[PDB]
Amino acid sequence: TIANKIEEYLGAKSDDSKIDELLKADPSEVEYYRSGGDGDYLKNNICKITVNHSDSGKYDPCEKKLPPYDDNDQWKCQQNSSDGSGKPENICVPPRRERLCTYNLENLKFDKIRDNNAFLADVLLTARNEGEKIVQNHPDTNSSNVCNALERSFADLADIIRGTDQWKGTNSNLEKNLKQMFAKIRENDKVLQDKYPKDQKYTKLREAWWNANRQKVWEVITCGARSNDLLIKRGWKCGHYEKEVPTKLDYVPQFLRWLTEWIEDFYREKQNLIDDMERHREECTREDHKSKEGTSYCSTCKDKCKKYCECVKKWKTEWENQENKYKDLYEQNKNKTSQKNTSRYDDYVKDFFEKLEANYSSLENYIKGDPYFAEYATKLSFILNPSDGILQENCSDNKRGSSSNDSCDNKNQDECKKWIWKKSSGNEEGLQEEYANTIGLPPRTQSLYLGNLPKLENVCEDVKDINFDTKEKFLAGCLIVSFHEGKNLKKRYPKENLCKALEYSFADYGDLIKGTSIWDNEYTKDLELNLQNNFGKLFGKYIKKNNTAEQDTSYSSLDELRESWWNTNKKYIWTAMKHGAEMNITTCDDIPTIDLIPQYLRFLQEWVENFCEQRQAKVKDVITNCKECKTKCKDECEKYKKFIEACGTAGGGIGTAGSPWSKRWDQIYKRYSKHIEDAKRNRKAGDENKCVQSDIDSFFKHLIDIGLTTPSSYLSNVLDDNICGADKAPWTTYTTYTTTEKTLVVVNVPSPLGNTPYRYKYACQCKIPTNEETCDDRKEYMNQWSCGDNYELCKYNGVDVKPTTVRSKLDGNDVTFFNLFEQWNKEIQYQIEQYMTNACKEKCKCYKLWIEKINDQWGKQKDNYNKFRSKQIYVSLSNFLFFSCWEEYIQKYFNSKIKNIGSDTFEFLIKKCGNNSAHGEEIFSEKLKNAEKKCKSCDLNATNYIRGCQSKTYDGKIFPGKGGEKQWICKDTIIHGDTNGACIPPRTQNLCVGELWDKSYGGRSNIKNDTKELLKEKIKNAIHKETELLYEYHDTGTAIISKNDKKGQKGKNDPNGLPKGFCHAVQRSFIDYKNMILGTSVNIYEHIGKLQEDIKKIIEKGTPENVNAWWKGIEREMWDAVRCAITKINKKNNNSIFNGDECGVSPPTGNDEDQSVSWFKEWGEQFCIERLRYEQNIREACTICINSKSGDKIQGACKRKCEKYKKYISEKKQEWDKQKTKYENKYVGKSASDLLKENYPECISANFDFIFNDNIEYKTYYPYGDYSSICSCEQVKYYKYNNAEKKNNKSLCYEKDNDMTWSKKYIKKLENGRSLEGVYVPPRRQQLCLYELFPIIIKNEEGMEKAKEELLETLQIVAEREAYYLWKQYNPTGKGIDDANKKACCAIRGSFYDLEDIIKGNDLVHDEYTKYIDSKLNEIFGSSNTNDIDTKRARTDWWENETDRKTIRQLVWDAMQSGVRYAVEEKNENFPLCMGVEHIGIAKPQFIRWLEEWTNEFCEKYTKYFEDMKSKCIECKKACANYTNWLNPKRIEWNGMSNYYNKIYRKSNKESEDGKDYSMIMAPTVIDYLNKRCHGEINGNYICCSCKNIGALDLMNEVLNKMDKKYSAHKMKCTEVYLEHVEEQLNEIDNAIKDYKL
């Protein structure tokens, strides 16, 4: 076995060993041993394996906590354990092996490996730990030293796993272990059960397994090696990407390997001695020995001389003895004895013994070739032939604050051609294997006079040898290289670009002398070796930080004492290059601070300057001849076309190297994005003075928090914004377009690098554009349906008509019509709403423009629906539209199309839909018309005396009068406001009817002998008096609405000079009189019913209804009357005389004229003001529970105030309940809490449905609602899993609903014109359990830096209980424990991510809870003045830093785990196969997560409903009805969501709609994203959707408009049964309408 020829046949047992396909184990299976294992987190990159893969307690990093590789000159050569008795050293053992990081394999005693895969994972973990301990600990030359040491440890591991160990130690403990696991493996496989030769076939089968997994183990063990290591001396890199085990060292004999090891270790250390005896060589005695001065400076020379002598003597003895031990077996190889016999194997030791001992005295060419042997001499005889300029600072990059030019200055210090992109460089100019073809080495770099050098010391042809001994000589070599290169470059180019390219070349040197060259060539990776071993001699003596304290003063790690050397002395390099290319004079001390930028980024900026210069040259002519296009500029546009479209043809740009610009940009984007993602997950960031320190990772992490993902954005930031293009096309605006492939309609999105420059797309081939497309590209309104005598079908989109026959009955294309119409009719209706809410004038023109589109579409649909009915005449678009608009409601709340007990919603529907009971389609025409009309005196003695009205008292008598208050009269009464709905306001009750009514003994209508005129005049006078009284009542602050906080009830004054809320009071009083005049739901005074009767009589006698018209006419009269009132009052007022422009020039609008609605609004404002007053009083009385006895309840002051609040809220509970249910019934869809919140900003902190909570626990555990917080002084503490007491009933939110649907509501209105929509809240997220947060948050408003404690506690509590309840909702609601556990784990992870986004404030919902929660988080973390982005950063990293060794999003995850454990224990099951991971990754953007969840649940429901319907089909009416009722509303979901995706994909934190950082999503379309996302299993982590043969994933969009094949088989039956159901349900609805009409 020469190890070169015999082995290739003795090897090759990994291809003809079909067991290998099952013996090729691999990690990346389901969670490993429930100890943090994972599948994808390793298949993506096997390198990033952690200890948490088998048990991490037994399998921790090797627990031999004996100093590794940093020890004395220990060499087990003497009597140590058994070697030394008769055989002094059985085998040449270095300390390296004794530190072989296999103590992970001492504590492996366990059996459930259940695959070769887990055992592979264990051994690979050991290999990776060994590789790390090697690389971080190897103070040496050190390139060859570290590389050889790594491969030698790999070969030692090979022997160990193969069992061919020769060192004796604690191996049997793991030896019989690996025996038993291998036995387990061979009993797992039937094919390998063909191999049971005793003993368990250790040797042969372990060799087979080693040859099966050697590739993986070698690949991983070298992963922890920096790229600038040059591992393998075959491509002499990092040796990691060799794609095959490059070394054969694992195959050489173990004992031969170790004797070579040992001789080379002696060799390295003896060269160390021969050079370090020259430390004080100025006084080292190369002459007569002197020791008279008595110091350790001259006698040391002889000391080390004799030490080296004794070393060589002892090594001589041990060498010759080792020779004998491998030789004294001559006449006994082989007998079967174990006295002094060494037995190694049957294939590799035999040839060794017969060659090197029997017939040959010494060994052969191999060990002579690579490992040198006679540096001093060979003294072993198994091989013969013995030959016997600075020293200064580093920098940590203080970075600036985004001044649009991206130049980080400097930081702390220290004391002492043609852009070939081809592929990873094989044997010529290319890129390193990391950057196979991603950024594309520019042509100036190649041929830079240094990469054109095999060796630096070959500075010039004139010099023959090396002067590099002193620092100055090496620095001068660098200087002359720099000067010559500058000369060459100036020779090249001619100017201003000169300095730019000179800066780039300077950065190239600055990276080469730091060894991080992204590229490489035939003269690279060897000059790099020369640089390293040169630095080893001079400036190589300070590398002594492979230690435990590191002293932070020697800066010792080859790079640091190399890159630090570069940071210094680069002033001299740059000046010399300036003194090279003669552009020297102070033009461009000054240093080009660009070298700190990663070389990849500048290889981007270069080649972007190239593309820009070419493009601006090619467009400058274009922008001329297209001037509106004048006559003929299509030719030069076509030149630009072909330039930017060429697949590297002759006609086209240069630098693209073949593939067109689009593909190359895509590669660049992928590389940059994955760099961003790698930078996201790493624990290194900006430290000395709050600055990002170091190499690519930290710099990229600095870009994040500035955005600057999507290299387009980077470019837009760092470019000059004018280098390319007369058309200032920004690097945002991806500008979609399509082209042919160079199968014909392929599309692309290059941002300012698509054909047809920025605006001149229309202008090419002049065709002066019309108004429609100028709207279309703006994407203003986008009705994408394209209707253009059969049916003239209104096609939706690029989903072509596929008419199918399953069948005057319905037949073929016929059905499609209805269904298409069914969707169009639906969607357009829905569509109309948003654009109704929509409305410079450009969008107005767009709005008109799509209006006639819709009008014509409706015209054609109406036309051909008549044709449809005509075919089916042997159901009229007035029946059907009515039915469908009713169906919207009946499916929204009900599902259930039978129970019709509304009796109040009926009015709302008939106003909306069904006047005259399904007679007319006019709802649609009316909506269209509405879309059309949306194209955007008493200053006399006004003694208005009343004998029966005095100062207002309903809110208490005016000061100093105390008491006399009124309350809210309620369900139907007589004395005040006979009204079945909302309760009666006290202000209404004390209305001051004036002289309009009197008593005269008690009770009397005095308006009996009057007519219109004097009655109205008396009304006017009464209004005057009552508004004067109201104004006085509000000036004094007696009015509850008028009272402010602790201030004198007048601190808030409106910007009109009027008492607070007195505006609203006057408006409500006017509304009260208005609704009183005509018969409405008001009787608001003793017997006003007779007053409406009196009006009806006294008016409807002379006019001949007419009361209504007369009131409408005199409405302006009475409103100008109250205007004149306010004028005279404010001129009587001590302030300035205001005008009739008191709030409302016209009377209050008829919209907010529903007396119930106005009453409710007034009540809500009253309630908010009183709640705030009570809260103020509480915080006054609950800030010093003071002196509480257990349990520590409120002690009477806090207790009394808070109990007053409790009683108040107790009665307002039923009050608000009744009022809100009446309102919501009357105003279906809208919510009372909103109405209050926008109409009254006074209560934003108020949270109805919580202060008025209905759950009993949320009353008994919450005795004071929201104020069951700080009112209750108990200092709630979170309890972990183990705690004897639990969080039982602490936050017992009810069990989650299962079938509540997605909502577009509560989506935040984002900013100026951003306005995200088409995004809908996932069900589980909107029914999120977060209630316990709200109360203490109210307490948390005060007491910063102490509230965060409570926040952490409540987050843990709520996370735990939420996980418990969500698991309960998923898992025990089912028995398929595998997939149920997977789905529950996915839901829990999604919930955790949503909660984290809430903490980070990146959540998109702003419902009553989350809105206030986010506001309070901002006010808490943002102390007083921090910018919004800074507040986000603070509440983000506070979420990211630990309290005690564990970060917030680790404690929360633990709370989730403990909640799941409670759920499992209660259900009495096993812990899930998921949920056990102790380290989850980072979250995709919440929109992406919601999209994934939506697809998952949609495919689930589809596979359920369609299967049910197919199985069913007389009765399957219910089945396909369920299917189609779930489908259609779910269809508009997808359209809006896909539209939003297309708006936001590949955009980064400064160009996406939201500020949220996207662009980890590289997919042109959402369909392409999903089919490339979860086309597989549904495992607990990172694959959470799973869709299967939905049409037997573009059939996703195909089926939403139910047109695909898989449904066409049943479409005909389903449409007929649907139509019959429509007929019967229409009958029912008209019957119900007729029923209500009485």
Residue numbers in the entry: 6 to 241, 258 to 409, 500 to 527, 556 to 633, 641 to 734, 748 to 786, 798 to 856, 873 to 928, ...
Task: Cite, word for word, the article reporting this structure.
Parasite-infected red blood cells sequester in the placenta through interaction between parasite-expressed protein VAR2CSA and the glycosaminoglycan chondroitin sulfate A (CS) abundantly present in the intervillous space. Here, we report cryo-EM structures of the VAR2CSA ectodomain at up to 3.1 Å resolution revealing an overall V-shaped architecture and a complex domain organization. Compared to other PfEMP1s, the ~310 kDa VAR2CSA ectodomain is relatively conserved among parasites. It is composed of a short N-terminal segment and six Duffy Binding-Like (DBL) domains (DBL1-DBL6) unique to VAR2CSA. Several of the DBL domains are linked by complex inter-domain (ID1-3) regions with limited or no homology among PfEMP1s yielding a DBL1-ID1-DBL2-ID2-DBL3-DBL4-ID3-DBL5-ID4-DBL6 structure.
The extracellular region from the N-terminal methionine (M1) to amino acid F2649 representing the entire ectodomain of the FCR3 VAR2CSA variant was expressed in baculovirus transfected insect cells as a secreted monomeric protein and purified by immobilized nickel affinity chromatography. As the binding to CSPG in NaCl buffer showed a 1:2 stoichiometry compared to a 1:1 in KCl buffer, the less compact VAR2CSA could introduce more unspecific binding or the proposed additional minor groove binding site is more exposed in NaCl buffer allowing CSPG binding. Structural analysis was performed in KCl buffer, as the highest affinity toward CSPG was observed. Next, we determined the cryo-EM structure of the isolated VAR2CSA form generated from a map of overall 3.8 Å resolution. The final model represents the ectodomain of VAR2CSA, exhibiting a well-folded conformation with clearly defined DBL domains and in agreement with previously published structures of DBL3, DBL4 and DBL6. The region spanning ID1-DBL2-ID2-DBL3-DBL4-ID3 represents the core of the macromolecular structure, as highlighted by a compact structure with a high degree of inter-domain interactions. The structure discloses the fold of ID2, forming a separate domain consisting of a bundle of α-helices, a shape which together with ID3, a 30 residues long α-helix (residue 1955-1985), serves as a structural glue for the core. Notably, ID2 and ID3 interact, as the C-terminus of ID2 forms an open-mouth shape conformation, which interacts extensively with the ID3 α-helix. DBL1 exhibits only a few inter-domain interaction sites with DBL2 and DBL4, leaving a cleft in-between the core and DBL1. The similarity of the VAR2CSA FCR3 apo-structures by Ma et al., and the one presented here is high, with RMSD in the core region (AA residue 450–2022) of 1.38 Å.
